UniProtKB/Swiss-Prot annotation:
Transmembrane segments: none annotated. Phosphorylated possibly by host MAPK1; this phosphorylation is necessary for Pin1-mediated virion uncoating. The chain holds residues 133 to 277 of 1435 of the full protein. This is Capsid protein p24. It is found in: Virion. Forms the conical core that encapsulates the genomic RNA-nucleocapsid complex in the virion. Most core are conical, with only 7% tubular. The core is constituted by capsid protein hexamer subunits. The core is disassembled soon after virion entry. Host restriction factors such as TRIM5-alpha or TRIMCyp bind retroviral capsids and cause premature capsid disassembly, leading to blocks in reverse transcription. Capsid restriction by TRIM5 is one of the factors which restricts HIV-1 to the human species. Host PIN1 apparently facilitates the virion uncoating. Residues 57-95 are annotated as: Interaction with human PPIA/CYPA and NUP153. The modification Phosphoserine is found at residue 16. Homodimer; the homodimer further multimerizes as homohexamers or homopentamers. Interacts with human PPIA/CYPA; This interaction stabilizes the capsid. Interacts with human NUP153. Interacts with host PDZD8; this interaction stabilizes the capsid. Interacts with monkey TRIM5; this interaction destabilizes the capsid. It comes from the Viruses. The record marks 89-90 as: Cis/trans isomerization of proline peptide bond.
Length: 145
């Protein structure tokens, strides 16, 4: 995740193993319950897309639900691309590129790119956008029970 230190410096840290442990244990108990969503949010403050994928990777023990979640993510990514069809290059040299859907979902962007977006002034909040997609997916599943 990205944390803000006392001088206002944004600092990246790898995801905590204790956070992953808690997430797995949560999901063991509340997998198809509405509580899984606020628990996911509670455990992903400042998360990068890479962090979120690491979290999802740890609970990949149920195809039907994870398959549903991945389908929702792909749907939301396609929708992003429809609203933001990316350009061949950035506006000028030195500028970051605008993220595609797969950049937001962390499959075609590097951690360094994610950090660059998230620590931009103001932030290009790719972790929060991805979180929204994941939450839409989790909501589908709890309805799917
Ligand atoms: C969102 C999410 C929620 C949960 C999980 N994992 C798990 O549920 N593992 C335990 C498996 S339950 C077993 C199960 C399969 C089907 C049914 C219900 N049928 C009888 C309708 O009952 C992963 C994600 Cl990604
Ligand atoms: Cl990376
Ligand atoms: Zn452009
Ligand atoms: Zn800028």
């Amino acid at each position: 995740p990205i944390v803000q230190n006392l001088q206002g410096q944004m600092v990246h840290q790898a995801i905590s193993p204790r956070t992953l442990n808690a997430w797995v244990k949560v999901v063991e108990e509340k997998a198809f319950s509405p509580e899984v969503i606020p628990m996911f949010s509670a455990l992903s403050e400042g998360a990068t897309p890479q962090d979120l994928n690491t979290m999802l990777n740890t609970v990949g023990g149920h195809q039907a639900a994870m398959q549903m979640l991945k389908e929702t993510i792909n749907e939301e990514a396609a929708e992003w691309d429809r609203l933001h069809p990316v350009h061949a290059g950035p506006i000028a040299p030195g500028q970051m590129r605008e993220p595609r859907g797969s950049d937001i979902a962390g499959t075609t962007s590097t951690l360094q790119e994610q950090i660059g977006w998230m620590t931009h002034n103001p932030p290009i909040p790719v972790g929060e956008i991805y979180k929204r997609w994941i939450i839409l997916g989790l909501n589908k599943i709890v309805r799917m029970y």
